[PDB]
């Protein structure tokens, strides 16, 4: 029985950036309802001298998850995963077969 302190309703991006930028620690964050698309949520976070925004979605079962990058081809999917790990916990980057 206690509300979520990170929840700031539907404040504009400016107010979220203007606020978070004044923080002194990497990871300073808030959850806000998206201006872009209704029903969605936006995770604003402070990092360096910038404020990054991550899209959060809620599906028909009430499950929450971060949005993921999406590609126009398998060729772009594999090449992207040459630099970014395919596994969430383990660090696995794709390499051309040898021999």
């Amino acid at each position: 029985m206690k509300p979520h302190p990170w929840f700031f309703g539907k404040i504009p991006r400016a107010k979220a950036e203007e606020m978070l930028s004044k923080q002194r620690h990497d990871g300073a964050f808030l959850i806000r309802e998206s201006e872009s698309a209704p029903g969605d949520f936006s995770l604003s976070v402070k990092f360096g001298n910038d404020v990054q925004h991550f899209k959060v979605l809620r599906d028909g079962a009430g499950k929450y998850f971060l949005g993921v990058v999406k590609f126009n081809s398998l060729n772009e999917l594999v090449d992207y995963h040459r630099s970014t790990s395919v596994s969430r916990n383990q660090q696995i980057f794709l390499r051309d077969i040898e021999q």
Binding site: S36, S42, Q52, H53, F54, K55, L66, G67, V68, V69
Partner: peptide, 5 residues
């Protein structure tokens, strides 16, 4: 404009 889009 989001990071993960």
């Amino acid at each position: 404009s989001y990071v993960n889009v």
